[PDB]
Amino acid sequence: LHGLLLDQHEEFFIKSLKQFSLRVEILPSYIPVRVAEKILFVGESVQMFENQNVLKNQEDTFAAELHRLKQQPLFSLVDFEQVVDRIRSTVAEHLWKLMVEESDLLGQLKIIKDFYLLGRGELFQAFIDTAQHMLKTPPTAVTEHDVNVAFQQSAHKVLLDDDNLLPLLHLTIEYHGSGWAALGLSYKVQWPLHILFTPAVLEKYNVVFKYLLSVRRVQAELQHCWALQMQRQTDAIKWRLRNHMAFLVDNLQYYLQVDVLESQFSQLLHQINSTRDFESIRLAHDHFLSNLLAQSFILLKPVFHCLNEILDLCHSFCSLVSQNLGPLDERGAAQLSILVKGFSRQSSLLFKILSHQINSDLAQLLLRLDYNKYYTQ
């Protein structure tokens, strides 16, 4: 009730999370970890409201209940577990409340959706378009600052001004030692939520943002490169059959995600709307990210190990058309033919892989039948 680890020179089995960690070596066998985890959690709970008083007045009642259980000359494990689970409830009933009612966890997650999950399609479209080529080149020292002001510009250039979100939002590159390769998104948070969005969680969102952006930029650059021929020879068949044969792989890794993201996030929002318990909120978000980790295809290791590779095969197509409407049988049409067979062949190894049997992989499964090329070549 008072956040005081009075355990000098000792262990009362509790060793910012350090000196706030459950030891279990020195823990009674007849006390479970199933309730020690509850103890530890309400202990960290008081630890983040006992400061910032420079949380309600029932401590005397709880002390009298604990003295009542102290006076029993027999150990009532179920009542001890019952009262500390009641105390854990009666803090969770307030931590939930401050996270929604006094911290707008919905609005924050909406921001995270809008940026880490590219939920602002118009904004990222204008960002990549206006900030393509200095991130296409390997980055210098000031280009992170330049894409930050181009990001600000992209956020205003859509003319749909939002709640002026920009102050928390900065685009940070691992510079020096390819700007699109080394770029990620940084974010900052307030003390009422600072615990939940511990960097361990945003580190993951950053990799997902990298994934999404990386495919999104190439899927984009391809489609503008297609227009370079469209300004009007037989080679314009091959260049643009090839365009389709590029289009299919990167649209397949991504037209899925447009569904898989919003769908997975529909589960999370209902689990936040479910119940008044921070443990449910916590495990709901843990369930949500650990789900989308699978949806990031990293667990489908072989196709993950061909992601940025086949993305670069699509770069090798996107670059090569950048120069003439005309006939390019000199080598263009020939090196193009490796990309005709390569994408369809890799997609055949992938089709065998799309046979976790999770609905997502079982949707990508769907997208190559009848036109059997991309599992038979």
Binding site: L118, G119, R120, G121, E122, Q125, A126, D129, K157, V158, L159, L160, Q219, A220, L222, Q223, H224, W226, A227, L228, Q229, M230, Q231, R232, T234, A236, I237, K238, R240, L241, N243, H244, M245, F247, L248, N251, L252, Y254, Y255, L256, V258, D259, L261, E262, S263, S266, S344, N359, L362, A363, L366, L367, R368, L369, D370, Y371, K373, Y374
Partner: protein, 419 residues
């Protein structure tokens, strides 16, 4: 980035005008250009911001010697482009040839709509295919913009005749196809036997078949602008809509399908047999789909769109057979927070059916009937001026016959190279 939205010619002004009308019950804007109180939609894509919340489509009026469309500038929704760009015959050469002196200031009016754009990617031209001055003048603004903005795309919205063969209707069609296949970027082409018999599956509107297909055409250009006007997490731009629909320079005319003809809930699985039907294709020999690219929007429920996608593939009762490797692509998108869409699950096919060429062949049957009777010919006193000896019509006929043959070669393995 952002698109200019020109219109010209009697049909072109009309399908643009009635598209702005159809937006006024699908999208967020009143006839004054004022944003409405039924406005999750981005207007800047096509609509210039004049400061007092006047969303103006980057849109223009040209109509030298019309029949009925003089009344469109006084009809309500024609005002939705407020910036005063009313300016300057009805047959095809009467447009292209007088353009030789007429382009010089309407190019400046287009640059005033380009000043309405933050930085241009392309022009929607709602110019008349067949119907009026945009046949000629619009298909020549194509060239005058190609001369000066050559990387900026022109997508063409269209109408296309086949109603049992005024009866001069086909004569103004063919020259669009020749100039379009010579240089142009895209043509959403929509047919007057196909949408006639689809309209009678939902409405009484057969008396003025031609004038009444404009409503479906307007919904189809609303559809092919939804993911642009709304934050779709794919295909928020013309290049993203088109890029596999037009996998080659020749076959750059496109076709569409709405199965929710009961336009005005049932889980999204429920459309995923009816959507297969070739009877719901609005550009209705032997026909296949070159590739499958389709949409769902509006009432987007995630297990429903996921499992509906599974169930159309489980049935597959449609001719998905050639070399173009997409069995189906869809994803999902946001939509406006108030106004409806087609059965609200809104699903539309855009899979490129080669049947579109059977309508080019029907247009050829019409043009051969007129070419053999030579009766409705009129020779309007500026219509002599483009053809030295009625040669570009015939050049269009060999070009569109190749177009007909090539859509059918694309129905087979042989279209790897021209021959």
């Amino acid at each position: 980035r952002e698109i200019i939205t020109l219109q010209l010619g009697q049909c072109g002004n009309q399908i643009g005008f009635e598209f702005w009308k159809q937006l006024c019950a699908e999208h967020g804007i009143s006839p004054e250009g004022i944003v409405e109180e039924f406005a999750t939609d981005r207007k800047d894509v096509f609509f210039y911001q004049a400061d007092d919340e006047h969303y103006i489509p980057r849109a223009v009026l040209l109509d030298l010697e019309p029949r009925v469309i003089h009344s469109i500038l006084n009809s309500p929704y024609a005002k939705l482009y407020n910036p005063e760009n009313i300016y300057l015959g009805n047959n095809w050469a009467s447009g292209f040839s007088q353009g030789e002196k007429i382009h010089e200031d309407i190019f400046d009016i287009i640059d005033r709509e380009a000043d309405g754009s933050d930085s241009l990617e392309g022009f929607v031209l709602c110019h008349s295919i067949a119907g009026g001055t945009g046949s000629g003048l619009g298909s020549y603004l194509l060239e005058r913009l190609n001369d000066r903005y050559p990387k900026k795309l022109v997508q063409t919205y269209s109408v296309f005749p086949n109603q049992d063969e005024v009866v001069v209707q086909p004569y103004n069609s063919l020259l669009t196809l020749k100039r379009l296949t010579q240089n142009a970027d895209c043509v959403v082409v929509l047919d007057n036997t196909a949408l006639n018999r689809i309209a009678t599956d939902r409405l009484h509107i057969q008396n003025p078949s031609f004038s009444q297909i404009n409503q479906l055409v307007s919904t189809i250009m609303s559809a092919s602008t939804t993911t642009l006007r709304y934050p779709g997490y794919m295909n928020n731009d013309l290049i993203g809509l088109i890029a596999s629909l037009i996998p080659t320079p020749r076959l750059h005319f496109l076709m569409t399908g709405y199965t929710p003809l009961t336009t005005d809930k049932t889980t999204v699985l429920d459309v995923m047999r009816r959507l297969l039907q070739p009877k719901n294709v609005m550009v209705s020999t032997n026909h296949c789909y070159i590739a499958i690219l389709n949409i769902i929007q509006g009432e987007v429920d995630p297990t429903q769109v996921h499992k509906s996608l599974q169930r159309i593939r489980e049935r597959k009762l449609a001719n998905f057979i050639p070399w173009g490797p997409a069995s189906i692509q869809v994803a999902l998108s946001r939509k406006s927070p108030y106004l409806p869409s087609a059965h609200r699950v809104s699903g539309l096919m855009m899979a490129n059916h080669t049947s579109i060429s059977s309508l080019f062949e029907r247009t050829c049957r019409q043009y051969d009937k007129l070419r053999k009777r030579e009766a409705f010919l009129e020779q309007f006193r500026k219509e002599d001026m483009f053809k030295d000896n009625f040669d570009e019509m015939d050049t269009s006929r060999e070009i569109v016959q190749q177009l007909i043959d090539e859509y059918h070669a694309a129905t087979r393995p042989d279209y790897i190279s021209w021959g």
